[PDB]
Every structure is written in structure tokens, then in C-alpha cells.
């Protein structure tokens, strides 16, 4: 029951060469493991790319190639295309079992990086009436599509009752997402300043408001 390891994430720009690896905990990957590389694009659309270490599937672009690098299997993508952004999984046949790697999320920068626009909404009077309070933090127009959100009440971090969505593409190709902080109305009344901070590419955009 070998364990297959892959880089969790890599970022490249159009036209560049990027190399992904696939390692086995059992030992060096050999042609006997029939290394496979499959590609998953948005909306879980899978398609095979490489089989038997270096065989390229039908219709697959020539810029994709498989090989072995040292004791690991590798996938090389030359002249990367924006369309090559996806999650790449490798699979090895060992111990009569096909074992998949955890997949590498490949980001291909197909547009300028963009900091997010943050908007913070206070709880509606109608909701407070049910003894509930939900603050909504909308995050739009960011790229790449990866952000971390932190909430603070009067300067102190809060995570209870906090949920954040996965990012999704907007019509303009940038990304959006939202975060929620839900408390009881009574708890919402025990704090004054609420803050939603979104960190993207090492830069934090903050938005706050006061209950009263």
C-alpha cells in the first residue's frame, strides 16, 4: 500500500516550462509502476494525459511529456498555456493496487494579479429580531483566486460562528468569495467594532463597522 506524494501547488506563467513530480514511499518509481498523469479542470472534468511513464494519450498536446527524474516520476509542460491550469494527479501501480497522488494544483497566471474589493454588511433588523446576527463580508475581483479571511471584534480575533466560501470565477474572469460571522443577537450586542480582513498575496484589505 504505497503512499504517493506530489507537490501541493505550483504557479507558473504562460510560455514557461513547469515540472511536476510524483514520489512513492516504497522506493524509486520505475517503469514497472506505469506512472500515469491525469488532469482535472474546473467542474471536475478529468482526462488522461500520460500512461506507462511516457506514453501520451490521444489528442493530448505535444507540450505534455512524462519521464522519470531520479527516483520519482515527472510531468513536464513546456510553453504553458493558460488553459493548462488544473489539478494534476499522478497514479502508480504497485502491490496490485493503483494508488493516486494527492494532486498538484497548477496555477497559470493568465491575467494581472488583483487585490480584492471588500464590502462588509451588518446584520438586518429582521434577523436580529430572531435573536440572530450574521455579518456578511463580500470579496470580489481578486486574482489569483486564493484568500484567507480573519474576523475581529474590537481588535480581538474571532472564529466561532465563522464560515468562508470557496472562491469561484466571476464573469470577468477574476474571483469572488464571501465570509460570514454569525452570533446570537445578544452576543452581537456585546461588541462594538467588527472587522473583516482579507489577506491576498501577502497583502491585507480590511473593512470594519460599528454596531451602534
Amino acid at each position: 500500500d504505497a503512499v504517493v506524494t506530489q507537490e501541493s501547488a505550483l504557479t507558473t506563467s504562460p510560455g514557461e516550462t513547469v515540472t511536476l513530480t510524483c514520489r512513492s514511499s516504497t522506493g524509486a518509481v520505475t517503469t514497472s509502476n506505469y506512472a500515469n498523469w491525469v488532469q482535472e479542470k474546473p467542474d471536475h472534468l478529468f482526462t488522461g494525459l500520460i500512461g506507462g511513464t511516457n506514453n501520451r494519450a490521444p489528442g493530448v498536446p505535444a507540450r505534455f511529456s512524462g519521464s522519470l527524474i531520479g527516483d520519482k516520476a515527472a510531468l513536464t509542460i513546456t510553453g504553458a498555456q493558460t488553459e493548462d491550469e488544473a489539478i494534476y494527479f499522478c497514479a502508480l501501480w504497485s502491490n496490485n493496487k493503483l494508488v493516486f497522488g494527492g494532486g498538484t494544483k497548477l496555477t497559470v497566471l493568465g491575467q494581472p494579479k488583483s487585490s480584492p474589493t471588500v464590502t462588509l454588511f451588518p446584520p438586518s433588523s429582521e434577523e436580529l429580531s430572531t435573536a440572530k446576527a450574521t455579518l456578511v463580508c463580500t470579496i470580489t475581483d481578486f486574482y489569483p483566486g486564493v484568500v484567507t479571511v480573519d474576523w475581529k471584534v474590537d481588535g480581538t480575533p474571532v472564529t466561532a460562528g465563522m464560515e468562508t466560501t470557496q472562491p469561484s470565477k466571476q464573469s470577468n474572469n477574476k474571483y469572488m468569495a464571501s465570509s460570514y460571522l454569525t452570533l446570537t443577537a445578544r452576543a452581537w450586542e456585546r461588541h462594538s467594532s467588527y472587522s473583516c480582513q482579507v489577506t491576498h498575496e501577502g497583502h491585507s484589505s480590511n473593512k470594519t463597522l460599528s454596531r451602534a
Binding site: 471536475h44 488522461g48 500512461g51 497514479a91 454588511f121 468569495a177
Partner: protein, 215 residues
């Protein structure tokens, strides 16, 4: 034109049994092994097993020997995988994929089948208006909270407001879904004019129109 088409999404209750199909076209179905794969968030990809339609021979990931059963029909060129005694751990997207011997790998994949094993009941959402804290633009929104199952639809001014709209993906909050939608309009159009979000939740057959009024 090789293609593998799988059955649609499934919503099952714990203890039930589901049969997922995989229809092949564009090639000789009996001559190629068909792999079955499980994709569960936080669990990457697991190999369930495979079957060769021509011989009926199978190979299982021992971990799935008492959970899955493989069948195939060379008459209808369809492969099936049945999962028994369903539990929450069985919730995921299942794929069938063609293995080609001389290629030593999987080339074509089915689109995947989403299996949701739950005992939760249909629950309508609560809709609340989202107004600014009372710029050239102004963003308004609507909170659609506590519904099940997905999805819900949100339009603004009965569709009259389409540009500047952002309806976000839903997220789970204590076993129920929460979604929000926002619309950005010229600061001169609101409160000047009216902005209403129209929320619909087909499953519970609920519809709510909530006007966004200055706080």
C-alpha cells in the same frame, strides 16, 4: 469519438444502496478495462477497482470488497458500480475511466457522479436584506440562510438588474446552506429607485421578495 457517460447526481439516505452507470460509445466496450474512482474532499482520489467487460473479470481495492460490486452489459455497452450500506463516508464524486493496455494508463474519463448520503430534510431559507452602514457606486445584498438542499436562485428587480450582480457559492453553517448575493448600482439609483432581490428555493418551493431599504 470515445466517450463515457455516467448517471446523474444521487441523494441517498444512510443504509440505502445506489447503482452508478457508465455508458461507453465510440469504441469496442468489451475490450477495455473500466476503472472506478472515488473523489472525496480532503481525501484526494481512491481506486475502488476495475472490470473487463469482455470477460467479466474484476479486481478490487480490498478496502472496497464489501462495499462495491461491478457489473457490465456488452449488449448496452454500459458498466455499473453498486455501493451498498451507504454511510456519510460514501459521499463523494465517482468516476469511471477507460484503461488501455498498450498505453498503460487511463485515457477517457466519465464526467463523474455526485453521491450525497444524508438524512437531512428539505428546509426553506430565511431571506434578509443587506444594506450599507448608514463613493460613486453602492453595493446592496441579500442573505439567504439556513436552507437545504441546494440550490437557490437570486435575481434583482425581477431580472431588470443584471450587471453588477454577484451571487456567491453557498457554504455549510451547522448542517444547512448559507448563500448571499450582492448588486452594485450607481449611487444615484438607490435609494432613489427601488432594489428588490427575488429569492427562490425550488426544493421547498419557497419564494421571497425582499426590498433593500436604507438602515
Amino acid at each position: 469519438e470515445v466517450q463515457l457517460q455516467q448517471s446523474g447526481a444521487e441523494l441517498m439516505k444512510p443504509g440505502a444502496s445506489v447503482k452508478i452507470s457508465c455508458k461507453a460509445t465510440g469504441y469496442t466496450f468489451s475490450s477495455y478495462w473500466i476503472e472506478w474512482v472515488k473523489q472525496r474532499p480532503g481525501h484526494g482520489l481512491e481506486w475502488i477497482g476495475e472490470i473487463l467487460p469482455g470477460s467479466g473479470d474484476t479486481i478490487f481495492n480490498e478496502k472496497f470488497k464489501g462495499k462495491a460490486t461491478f457489473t457490465a452489459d456488452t449488449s448496452s455497452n454500459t458498466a455499473y458500480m453498486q455501493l451498498s450500506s451507504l454511510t456519510s463516508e460514501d459521499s463523494a464524486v465517482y468516476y469511471c475511466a477507460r484503461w488501455v493496455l498498450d498505453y498503460y494508463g487511463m485515457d477517457y474519463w466519465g464526467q463523474g457522479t455526485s453521491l450525497t448520503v444524508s438524512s437531512a430534510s428539505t428546509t426553506p431559507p430565511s431571506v434578509y436584506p443587506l444594506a450599507p452602514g448608514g463613493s460613486a457606486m453602492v453595493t446592496l445584498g441579500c442573505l439567504v440562510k439556513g436552507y437545504f438542499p441546494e440550490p437557490v436562485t437570486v435575481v434583482w428587480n425581477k431580472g431588470s438588474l443584471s450587471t453588477g450582480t454577484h451571487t456567491f457559492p453557498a457554504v455549510l453553517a451547522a448542517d444547512l446552506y448559507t448563500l448571499s448575493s450582492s448588486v452594485t448600482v450607481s449611487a444615484s439609483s438607490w435609494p432613489g429607485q427601488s432594489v428588490t432581490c427575488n429569492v427562490a428555493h425550488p426544493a421547498s418551493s419557497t419564494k421571497v421578495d425582499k426590498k433593500i431599504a436604507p438602515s
